Amino acid sequence: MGPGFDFAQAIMKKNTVIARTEKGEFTMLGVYDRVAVIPTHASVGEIIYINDVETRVLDACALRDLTDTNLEITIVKLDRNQKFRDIRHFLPRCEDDYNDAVLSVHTSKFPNMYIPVGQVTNYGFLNLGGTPTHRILMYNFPTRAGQCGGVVTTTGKVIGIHVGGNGAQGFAAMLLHSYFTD
Ligand SMILES: C[C@H](NC(=O)C1CC1)c1cccnc1
């Protein structure tokens, strides 16, 4: 509808796949080469389904901060025959607050879904499903089951992936450029 939705659509149309684990179907953001991200609660194993194709997992790492606190981001390297467009230059370098974000989801349950969530707060600490979690972004939208993995964007930046909600607020794990250096 506007330039925020334009940036979101551009990311969804080239840098997302549908990931299926034994814990459900997730929006999965591809970042570069065969490297993608997914919420750690997806419990990625040795095999994952990518757009309904059986795919070997070459590496999976559940990220934690240097205090050994959960970040709720798993970085997955896929045995896929195709690379993602490199979008690392759209990742923030530092923790921040944002205006006017969009949450975008693409699954069997919610295809081509875009939600203007408004202002995004650097919330920090969250007890997420009983797990102490750091680097949480918060937005005041009543997000629902089916939205985990959804991509949070502003104009020009890919800032997070949706990891939970409390019925009134939604919560995303930050994406930082430093997670994807090689
Ligand atoms: C304007 C456009 N932006 C995107 O693709 C956003 C979705 C990432 C673009 C065009 C040419 C080179 N870089 C970027």
Tab-separated table of C-alpha atoms and ligand atoms in Angstrom:
chain	number	residue	atom	x	y	z
A	1	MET	CA	0.000	0.000	0.000
A	2	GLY	CA	3.034	2.346	0.698
A	3	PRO	CA	6.921	2.280	0.714
A	4	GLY	CA	7.122	0.166	3.952
A	5	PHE	CA	4.982	-2.563	2.323
A	6	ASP	CA	7.138	-2.159	-0.851
A	7	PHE	CA	10.398	-3.005	1.052
A	8	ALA	CA	8.625	-5.873	2.936
A	9	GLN	CA	7.268	-7.401	-0.320
A	10	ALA	CA	10.715	-7.185	-1.992
A	11	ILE	CA	12.187	-9.238	0.922
A	12	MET	CA	9.319	-11.762	0.990
A	13	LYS	CA	9.335	-12.409	-2.804
A	14	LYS	CA	13.076	-13.337	-2.975
A	15	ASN	CA	14.398	-14.069	0.575
A	16	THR	CA	11.782	-16.367	2.213
A	17	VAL	CA	10.956	-20.091	2.145
A	18	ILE	CA	8.368	-22.129	4.019
A	19	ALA	CA	10.270	-24.224	6.627
A	20	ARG	CA	8.570	-27.266	8.221
A	21	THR	CA	9.943	-29.027	11.351
A	22	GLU	CA	8.182	-31.479	13.747
A	23	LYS	CA	7.072	-28.299	15.668
A	24	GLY	CA	5.151	-26.809	12.620
A	25	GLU	CA	5.441	-24.556	9.558
A	26	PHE	CA	7.488	-21.315	9.886
A	27	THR	CA	8.322	-18.289	7.756
A	28	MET	CA	12.108	-18.675	7.199
A	29	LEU	CA	14.321	-15.730	6.119
A	30	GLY	CA	17.235	-16.542	3.814
A	31	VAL	CA	20.126	-14.104	4.432
A	32	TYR	CA	22.935	-15.100	1.981
A	33	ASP	CA	24.368	-18.199	0.233
A	34	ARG	CA	22.480	-21.230	1.774
A	35	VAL	CA	22.211	-19.532	5.261
A	36	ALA	CA	18.767	-18.819	6.761
A	37	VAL	CA	17.280	-18.029	10.204
A	38	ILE	CA	14.314	-19.462	12.148
A	39	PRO	CA	13.090	-19.167	15.776
A	40	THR	CA	15.033	-21.576	18.057
A	41	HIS	CA	11.703	-23.052	19.306
A	42	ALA	CA	11.264	-24.584	15.767
A	43	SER	CA	13.778	-27.275	17.064
A	44	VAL	CA	15.651	-27.693	13.737
A	45	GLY	CA	17.063	-31.240	13.346
A	46	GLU	CA	19.277	-33.033	10.770
A	47	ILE	CA	16.443	-32.867	8.108
A	48	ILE	CA	13.993	-29.987	7.450
A	49	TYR	CA	11.290	-29.470	4.741
A	50	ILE	CA	11.901	-26.302	2.588
A	51	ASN	CA	8.856	-25.486	0.344
A	52	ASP	CA	7.845	-29.198	0.924
A	53	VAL	CA	11.241	-30.593	-0.289
A	54	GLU	CA	13.222	-32.847	2.102
A	55	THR	CA	16.487	-30.932	2.785
A	56	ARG	CA	19.589	-31.939	4.778
A	57	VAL	CA	20.687	-29.442	7.456
A	58	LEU	CA	24.489	-28.894	7.013
A	59	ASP	CA	24.768	-26.826	10.250
A	60	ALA	CA	22.387	-25.328	12.855
A	61	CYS	CA	23.450	-22.955	15.679
A	62	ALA	CA	21.087	-21.682	18.439
A	63	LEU	CA	22.542	-18.233	19.209
A	64	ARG	CA	23.141	-17.035	22.781
A	65	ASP	CA	24.656	-13.720	23.964
A	66	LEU	CA	28.011	-13.538	25.765
A	67	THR	CA	26.111	-13.712	29.142
A	68	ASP	CA	25.016	-17.252	27.851
A	69	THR	CA	21.367	-15.940	27.561
A	70	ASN	CA	19.027	-17.268	24.825
A	71	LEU	CA	18.580	-14.970	21.733
A	72	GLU	CA	15.848	-17.251	20.162
A	73	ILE	CA	17.615	-17.131	16.709
A	74	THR	CA	18.838	-20.369	15.073
A	75	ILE	CA	21.133	-19.913	12.004
A	76	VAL	CA	20.681	-22.858	9.601
A	77	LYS	CA	22.875	-23.768	6.620
A	78	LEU	CA	20.704	-25.744	4.111
A	79	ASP	CA	21.905	-28.406	1.596
A	80	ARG	CA	19.951	-26.519	-1.116
A	81	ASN	CA	20.855	-26.315	-4.853
A	82	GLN	CA	20.247	-22.527	-4.977
A	83	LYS	CA	21.636	-19.465	-3.087
A	84	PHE	CA	19.625	-16.617	-1.556
A	85	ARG	CA	20.047	-13.039	-2.694
A	86	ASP	CA	22.580	-11.525	-0.244
A	87	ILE	CA	20.610	-9.087	2.022
A	88	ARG	CA	23.240	-8.678	4.802
A	89	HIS	CA	23.640	-4.962	3.875
A	90	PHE	CA	20.004	-4.402	5.065
A	91	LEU	CA	20.782	-5.711	8.620
A	92	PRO	CA	21.293	-3.186	11.449
A	93	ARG	CA	24.725	-3.051	13.080
A	94	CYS	CA	23.449	-2.093	16.603
A	95	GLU	CA	20.470	-2.586	18.961
A	96	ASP	CA	17.899	0.186	18.306
A	97	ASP	CA	14.267	1.334	18.398
A	98	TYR	CA	12.373	1.886	15.095
A	99	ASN	CA	9.323	3.629	13.685
A	100	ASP	CA	6.692	2.273	11.307
A	101	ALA	CA	7.589	-1.446	10.964
A	102	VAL	CA	5.833	-4.202	8.949
A	103	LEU	CA	5.605	-7.865	10.012
A	104	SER	CA	5.400	-10.165	6.924
A	105	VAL	CA	4.401	-13.898	7.017
A	106	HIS	CA	4.214	-16.523	4.295
A	107	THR	CA	2.933	-20.036	5.194
A	108	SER	CA	0.178	-22.481	4.016
A	109	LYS	CA	-2.082	-20.996	6.802
A	110	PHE	CA	-1.132	-17.302	6.086
A	111	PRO	CA	0.112	-16.675	2.505
A	112	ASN	CA	1.078	-13.135	1.460
A	113	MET	CA	0.292	-11.673	4.926
A	114	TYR	CA	1.599	-8.128	5.789
A	115	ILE	CA	0.834	-6.320	9.126
A	116	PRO	CA	1.723	-2.626	9.876
A	117	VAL	CA	2.738	-2.968	13.559
A	118	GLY	CA	3.807	0.706	14.150
A	119	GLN	CA	6.556	1.702	16.602
A	120	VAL	CA	9.122	-0.955	17.660
A	121	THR	CA	10.691	-0.664	21.180
A	122	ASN	CA	14.123	-2.104	22.078
A	123	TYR	CA	12.457	-4.059	24.950
A	124	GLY	CA	15.584	-6.059	25.931
A	125	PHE	CA	14.838	-8.815	28.468
A	126	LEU	CA	11.766	-11.074	28.068
A	127	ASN	CA	10.801	-14.278	29.844
A	128	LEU	CA	9.731	-16.000	26.616
A	129	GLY	CA	7.755	-19.229	27.291
A	130	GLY	CA	9.686	-19.491	30.621
A	131	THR	CA	13.094	-18.935	28.900
A	132	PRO	CA	15.076	-15.748	29.818
A	133	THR	CA	15.705	-14.077	26.410
A	134	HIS	CA	17.696	-10.925	25.432
A	135	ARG	CA	17.648	-8.451	22.449
A	136	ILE	CA	13.817	-8.507	22.185
A	137	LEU	CA	11.928	-5.953	20.059
A	138	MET	CA	8.297	-5.223	21.039
A	139	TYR	CA	5.351	-3.878	18.980
A	140	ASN	CA	1.773	-3.249	20.094
A	141	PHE	CA	-0.065	-5.678	17.752
A	142	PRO	CA	-2.098	-8.757	18.862
A	143	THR	CA	-0.001	-11.275	16.842
A	144	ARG	CA	-1.220	-14.953	16.789
A	145	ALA	CA	0.050	-18.527	16.333
A	146	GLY	CA	1.157	-18.998	12.694
A	147	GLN	CA	3.280	-15.764	12.706
A	148	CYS	CA	6.563	-17.124	14.268
A	149	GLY	CA	9.466	-16.586	11.880
A	150	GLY	CA	7.660	-13.604	10.313
A	151	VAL	CA	10.060	-10.920	9.070
A	152	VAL	CA	10.085	-7.464	10.756
A	153	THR	CA	11.198	-4.664	8.380
A	154	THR	CA	11.345	-0.913	8.153
A	155	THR	CA	12.022	0.986	4.886
A	156	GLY	CA	15.602	-0.008	4.180
A	157	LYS	CA	16.152	-2.470	7.092
A	158	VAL	CA	15.476	-6.120	8.042
A	159	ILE	CA	15.436	-5.769	11.864
A	160	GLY	CA	14.070	-9.025	13.404
A	161	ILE	CA	12.063	-12.252	13.256
A	162	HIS	CA	8.774	-12.700	15.197
A	163	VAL	CA	9.218	-15.192	18.149
A	164	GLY	CA	6.105	-14.686	20.359
A	165	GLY	CA	3.312	-12.561	21.841
A	166	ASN	CA	1.124	-12.077	24.981
A	167	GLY	CA	-2.204	-11.432	23.105
A	168	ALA	CA	-1.768	-7.567	23.122
A	169	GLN	CA	2.001	-7.212	22.250
A	170	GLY	CA	4.267	-9.087	19.783
A	171	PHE	CA	7.958	-9.826	20.258
A	172	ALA	CA	10.774	-10.250	17.731
A	173	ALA	CA	14.406	-11.395	18.112
A	174	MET	CA	16.829	-8.790	16.723
A	175	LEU	CA	18.887	-9.512	13.593
A	176	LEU	CA	22.359	-7.906	13.701
A	177	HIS	CA	24.912	-7.769	10.843
A	178	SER	CA	27.523	-9.334	13.214
A	179	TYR	CA	25.575	-12.673	13.342
A	180	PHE	CA	26.333	-13.282	9.561
A	181	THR	CA	30.027	-12.351	9.027
A	182	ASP	CA	32.140	-15.278	7.499
B	1	LIG	C1	15.455	-0.598	-3.773
B	1	LIG	C2	15.797	-2.085	-3.722
B	1	LIG	N1	15.628	-2.546	-2.334
B	1	LIG	C3	15.416	-3.827	-2.011
B	1	LIG	O1	15.560	-4.750	-2.800
B	1	LIG	C4	15.034	-4.072	-0.610
B	1	LIG	C5	14.241	-5.319	-0.322
B	1	LIG	C6	15.668	-5.259	0.063
B	1	LIG	C7	17.177	-2.397	-4.299
B	1	LIG	C8	17.418	-2.336	-5.670
B	1	LIG	C9	18.704	-2.515	-6.164
B	1	LIG	C10	19.721	-2.777	-5.265
B	1	LIG	N2	19.516	-2.882	-3.938
B	1	LIG	C11	18.271	-2.687	-3.487
